[PDB]
Structure formats: structure tokens, C-alpha cells
Design an enzyme around this catalytic site. Structure first.
Site, PDB file in Angstrom:
ATOM      1  N   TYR A   1       2.183  11.805   1.402  1.00 33.77           N
ATOM      2  CA  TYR A   1       1.788  11.071  -0.403  1.00 33.77           C
ATOM      3  C   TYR A   1       0.421  11.566  -0.840  1.00 33.77           C
ATOM      4  O   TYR A   1      -0.726  12.241  -0.811  1.00 33.77           O
ATOM      5  CB  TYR A   1       0.645   9.801   0.669  1.00 33.77           C
ATOM      6  CG  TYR A   1       1.316   8.459   1.639  1.00 33.77           C
ATOM      7  CD1 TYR A   1       2.196   7.741   0.640  1.00 33.77           C
ATOM      8  CD2 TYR A   1       1.358   8.720   2.657  1.00 33.77           C
ATOM      9  CE1 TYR A   1       3.062   6.982   1.472  1.00 33.77           C
ATOM     10  CE2 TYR A   1       1.786   7.094   3.605  1.00 33.77           C
ATOM     11  CZ  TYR A   1       3.321   6.235   3.266  1.00 33.77           C
ATOM     12  OH  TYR A   1       3.919   5.552   4.143  1.00 33.77           O
TER      13      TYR A   1
ATOM     14  N   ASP B   1       7.702   1.855   1.364  1.00 33.79           N
ATOM     15  CA  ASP B   1       7.821   1.993   2.482  1.00 33.79           C
ATOM     16  C   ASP B   1       7.107   0.759   3.549  1.00 33.79           C
ATOM     17  O   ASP B   1       6.149  -0.163   2.573  1.00 33.79           O
ATOM     18  CB  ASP B   1       7.211   3.148   3.860  1.00 33.79           C
ATOM     19  CG  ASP B   1       5.860   3.731   3.246  1.00 33.79           C
ATOM     20  OD1 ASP B   1       6.124   4.872   2.824  1.00 33.79           O
ATOM     21  OD2 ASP B   1       4.870   2.957   3.602  1.00 33.79           O
TER      22      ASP B   1
ATOM     23  N   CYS C   1       4.860  11.006   5.546  1.00 34.00           N
ATOM     24  CA  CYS C   1       6.230  10.807   5.985  1.00 34.00           C
ATOM     25  C   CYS C   1       7.363  10.996   6.434  1.00 34.00           C
ATOM     26  O   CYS C   1       7.776  11.652   5.673  1.00 34.00           O
ATOM     27  CB  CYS C   1       6.485   9.234   6.244  1.00 34.00           C
ATOM     28  SG  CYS C   1       4.484   8.257   5.479  1.00 34.00           S
TER      29      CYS C   1
ATOM     30  N   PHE D   1       4.873   1.082   5.391  1.00 29.77           N
ATOM     31  CA  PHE D   1       3.271   1.403   5.722  1.00 29.77           C
ATOM     32  C   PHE D   1       2.579   0.377   4.574  1.00 29.77           C
ATOM     33  O   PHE D   1       1.650  -0.350   5.211  1.00 29.77           O
ATOM     34  CB  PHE D   1       2.864   2.987   5.572  1.00 29.77           C
ATOM     35  CG  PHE D   1       3.606   4.090   7.315  1.00 29.77           C
ATOM     36  CD1 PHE D   1       4.739   3.633   7.087  1.00 29.77           C
ATOM     37  CD2 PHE D   1       2.951   3.538   8.632  1.00 29.77           C
ATOM     38  CE1 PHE D   1       5.440   4.490   8.128  1.00 29.77           C
ATOM     39  CE2 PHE D   1       3.879   4.145   9.383  1.00 29.77           C
ATOM     40  CZ  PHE D   1       4.774   4.384   9.581  1.00 29.77           C
ATOM     41  N   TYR D   2       2.890   1.519   3.430  1.00 31.34           N
ATOM     42  CA  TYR D   2       1.339   1.040   2.476  1.00 31.34           C
ATOM     43  C   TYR D   2       2.257  -0.560   1.211  1.00 31.34           C
ATOM     44  O   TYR D   2       1.337  -0.171  -0.022  1.00 31.34           O
ATOM     45  CB  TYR D   2       1.384   2.151   1.596  1.00 31.34           C
ATOM     46  CG  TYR D   2       0.192   2.997   2.966  1.00 31.34           C
ATOM     47  CD1 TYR D   2       1.273   3.955   3.365  1.00 31.34           C
ATOM     48  CD2 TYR D   2      -0.955   2.415   3.339  1.00 31.34           C
ATOM     49  CE1 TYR D   2       0.333   5.144   4.542  1.00 31.34           C
ATOM     50  CE2 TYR D   2      -1.512   3.169   4.223  1.00 31.34           C
ATOM     51  CZ  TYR D   2      -0.564   4.772   4.656  1.00 31.34           C
ATOM     52  OH  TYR D   2      -1.687   4.449   5.721  1.00 31.34           O
TER      53      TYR D   2
ATOM     54  N   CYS E   1       5.392   8.210  10.660  1.00 28.94           N
ATOM     55  CA  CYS E   1       5.206   8.957   9.482  1.00 28.94           C
ATOM     56  C   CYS E   1       3.697  10.179  10.614  1.00 28.94           C
ATOM     57  O   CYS E   1       3.311   9.620  11.935  1.00 28.94           O
ATOM     58  CB  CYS E   1       3.436   7.758   8.670  1.00 28.94           C
ATOM     59  SG  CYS E   1       4.043   7.648   7.260  1.00 28.94           S
TER      60      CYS E   1
END
Length: 121
Positions: free
Chosen positions: A39, A65, A100, A67-68, A106
């Protein structure tokens, strides 16, 4: 082994970090395994007992993804030049980053301490 079951390799295998210093010129490098990414927003660079120029992160690619949501990521390799205007003896650079796997996990943020060679202003 069901698909992506061996993808949890050691973090230094997914993101192989190295550096090279020549007096005021420091190069930081990450070799980034296929199927893995960094990232942009998770990179932090902090000098200890050294003065460095502002660091501009380069333009990466956008990726989605869970995640964010949408964020800017780096694949293949990250090359980051740093300019050391001054560094005392025993100075260091603290480099933090997080990556990740496309397989769906990740790694935790990682920190590396770079020993900087002395640079007189």
C-alpha cells in the site's frame, strides 16, 4: 492444496527490502513477489540523527480489496530515492511499510532500520 494455500510465505520473501547508499544518495528497494502488493499510504520513512529531503512517493496503480476498498498500490518493485543532506555517525532511517497478497490476506506493517553512513552537511 486448494488454490492459494501456499501463498503465506515469510514477509521478507513477499517484499524483499534492500538499500544502497552513496554519500548523499540513498536508494531504497523492494522486490515485490508476483501476487503481492504494497500500500502506498502505509509507507513511513523517519530519520534518526539525520536530515533528509522531502520524500515523494511515486505513482502506483489502483486496486480494490476488502481491506480498504480502493487504494493505490505497488507491484513488481518499488524504487525510492532518498537524499541525505546530513547524517551523524550511527544515524538511522526507520522504514515502515505494509503489503498484502492477492490470495486474500494482509501482512502486518513491517519496520526496517537502515544504518546510514555518516554524511557531513
Amino acid at each position: 492444496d486448494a488454490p492459494g494455500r501456499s501463498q503465506f510465505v515469510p514477509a521478507d520473501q513477499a517484499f524483499a527490502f534492500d538499500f544502497q547508499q552513496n554519500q548523499h544518495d540513498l536508494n531504497l528497494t523492494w522486490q515485490i513477489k508476483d501476487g503481492y502488493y504494497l500500500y502506498r499510504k502505509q509507507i513511513r520513512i523517519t530519520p534518526e540523527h539525520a536530515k533528509i529531503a522531502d520524500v515523494q512517493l511515486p505513482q502506483g496503480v489502483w486496486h480494490e480489496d476488502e481491506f480498504y476498498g480502493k487504494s493505490e498500490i505497488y507491484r513488481d518493485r518499488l524504487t525510492l530515492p532518498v537524499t541525505i543532506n546530513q547524517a551523524s555517525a550511527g544515524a538511522t532511517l526507520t522504514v515502515t511499510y505494509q503489503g498484502c497478497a492477492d490470495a486474500g490476506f494482509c501482512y502486518p506493517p513491517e519496520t526496517k532500520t537502515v544504518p546510514l553512513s555518516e554524511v557531513v552537511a
